[PDB]
């Protein structure tokens, strides 16, 4: 599998993955699917801020997964901290894609001079939690019942990675 | 006296807002705002049904205020709101924070909400203590996710389940 920046041609493939995570998982906390327009607007807002959108792609340019990050919280104080997300196409799980994607994302965030990457994972998702811990992420939050989906309460686990521990001041 | 905020209260609220922005770590911005910014905010909340409460004396002065809004922008977190309380410098030690928080909790509760989140700069022990004595629990401790005054700031998340008897949403 090849990792590269997303182009507008990749949006249809990204839409398929996104809408699946929406309807069958707790990787996204929305229950409503979106259209291509919605993902096009999202793609542009990202390019505007200088934030990357990476995709795991086929020789046949098929989208197997994608990753990206944006602001964590809407205040000037958190500009050094971004929140990312990685999604892999259902049939592609268990092949190491999430690792390749998350590793590439970390390198871009680091090249951008960013300071902290935050992951917001549903607590029961052991697969995702283990993937991150192996990449240096540490648990820093356990928030019970802050979310809901499929008719039940969901717990949130915050994991974070410091990209430059030697940097004493902003 | 604790009561809802009216447009005649915006000036006093902005005075408090801007003092917190310039002298403290209670707000995570370094730039002050005008009265128009606060008028828009006033309107945004009323539209969402979110309260804005003020502590006022006999003269009608704004001694402090509290409010809450969304915590995160996904439908999945609509039972959870992030709130914040601000008390005027010269009115601390008068138990006004306690009063504002209590009234806001009864508000969030009567409104069908499930959880109230507070984001507090980890070094602010007085604020953390005020929340503990009211049922809040530490649910997050994040190092260097913020910055202000030229230094890294740690954030502490504290939450309060408003109705644990409800096993499903």
SS3 string, B86-106, reads EECHHHCCCCHHHHHHHHHHH
Separation CA A6–CA A63 (nearest Å): 10
Contact A56, A66 (CB under 8 A): yes
The answer to whether the CB atoms of A141 and B157 lie below 8 A apart is yes
**CATH classification of the domain holding A113:** 3.40.630.30
B20 closest CA partner among B88, B76, B83: B88
Residue B127 tokens read as: 């604020």
Provide the terminal-to-terminal Cα distance of chain A, rounded to the nearest Å.
37
Which tokens go with B42? 């006033």
B61, burial (CB in 10 Å: exposed 0-12, middle 13-18, buried 19+):
middle
How far apart are alpha carbons A65 and A54 in whole angstroms?
8
Find where tokens 């096993």 sit. B167
Domain count, chain B: 1
- How buried is A156 (Cβ within 10 angstroms: 0-12 exposed, 13-18 middle, 19+ buried)? buried
Identify which of A127, A130, A120, A128 has the alpha carbon closest to the alpha carbon of residue A159: A120
Resolution (A): 2.3
A153 and A145 Cβ atoms separated by less than 8 Å: yes
List of residues 6+ apart from A127 with CB closer than 8 A: A93
For chain B, the residue count is: 169
Convert B151-166 to b/e letters by CB count within 10 Å (16 or more is b).
ebbbbbbbbbbbeeee
> What percent of chain B is helix, strand and coil (3-state, nearest 5)?
35, 35, 30
One DSSP character per residue, chain A reads -EEEE--GGGHHHHHHHHHHHHHH-SSSS--S---HHHHHHHHHHHHHHT--EEEEE-TT--EEEEEEEEESSSSGGGTTEEEEEEEE-GGGTTSSHHHHHHHHHHHHHHHTT--EEEEEEETT-HHHHHHHHTTT-EEEEEEEEEEEETTEEEEEEEEEEES-TT----
Q: B53 has which bridge partners?
A: B4, B66
Q: What is the CA radius of gyration of chain A?
A: 16
CA gap A109, A70 in Å, rounded:
10
d(CA B164, CA B79): 12
* Nearest Cα residue to B154 out of A113, A85, A105, A115: A115
Min Cα distance A113 → chain B (Å) is: 14
Q: Which of B127, B115, B130, B113 is nearest to B155 (CA)?
A: B127
Closest partner residue to B115 among A32, A76, A145, by Cβ? A145
Chain A residues whose C-beta is within 8 A of a chain B C-beta are: 28-32, 72-73, 75-81, 115-116, 118, 120, 140-149, 151-154, 158, 160, 162, 168-170
Check residue B7 and report its DSSP letter. G
Task: Give φ, ψ of A114 to 5 degrees.
Answer: -75, 160
Contacts of A147 in chain B (CB under 8 A): 74, 76-77, 79-80
Which residue range forms the structural domain that includes residue B69?
A: 1-169
Q: Retrieve residue B55's tokens.
A: 């502590």
Question: For residues A132 and A105, what is the distance between their CA atoms, to the nearest angstrom?
Answer: 12
Residue B90: partners with Cβ closer than 8 Å, 6 or more residues away: none
Q: Which two tokens stand for residue A148?
A: 């809901």
Whether the CB-CB separation of A11 and A83 falls below 8 Å is answered with no
Q: SS3 of B133, please?
A: coil
- Residue A115 contacts residue A163 (beta carbons within 8 Å): yes
Q: How was this structure determined?
A: X-ray
Q: Rounded to an integer, what distance in angstroms lies between the CA atom of residue A103 and that of residue A100?
A: 5
* Neighboring chain A residues of B168 at a CB cutoff of 8 Å: 151-153
What is the distance between the alpha carbons of residues B113 and B50, in angstroms, rounded to a whole number? 11
CA distances B16 to A51, B1, B19, B62, B64, Å, are 35, 17, 5, 8, 7
- Is B161 strand, coil or helix? strand
Is residue A67 a contact partner of residue A102, using CB atoms and an 8 Å limit? yes
d(CA A69, CA A149): 23
């Amino acid at each position: 599998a090849s990792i590269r920046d997303a182009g507008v041609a990749d949006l249809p493939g990204i839409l398929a993955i996104y809408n699946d995570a929406v309807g069958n998982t707790t990787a996204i906390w929305n229950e409503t699917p979106v259209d291509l327009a919605n993902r096009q607007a999202w793609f542009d807002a990202r390019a505007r801020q200088g934030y990357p959108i990476l995709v795991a792609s086929d020789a046949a340019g098929e989208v197997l997964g994608y990753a990206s990050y944006g602001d964590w919280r809407p205040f000037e104080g958190f500009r050094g901290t971004v929140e990312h997300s990685v999604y892999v196409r259902d049939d592609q799980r268990g092949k190491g894609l999430g690792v390749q994607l998350l590793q590439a994302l970390i390198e871009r965030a680091r090249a951008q001079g960013l300071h902290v990457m935050v992951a917001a994972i549903e607590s029961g998702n052991a697969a995702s939690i283990g993937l991150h811990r192996r990449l240096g992420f540490e648990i820093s939050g356990q928030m019970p019942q802050v979310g809901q989906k499929f008719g039940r309460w969901l717990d949130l686990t915050f994991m974070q990675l410091n990209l430059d521990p030697t940097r004493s001041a902003p």
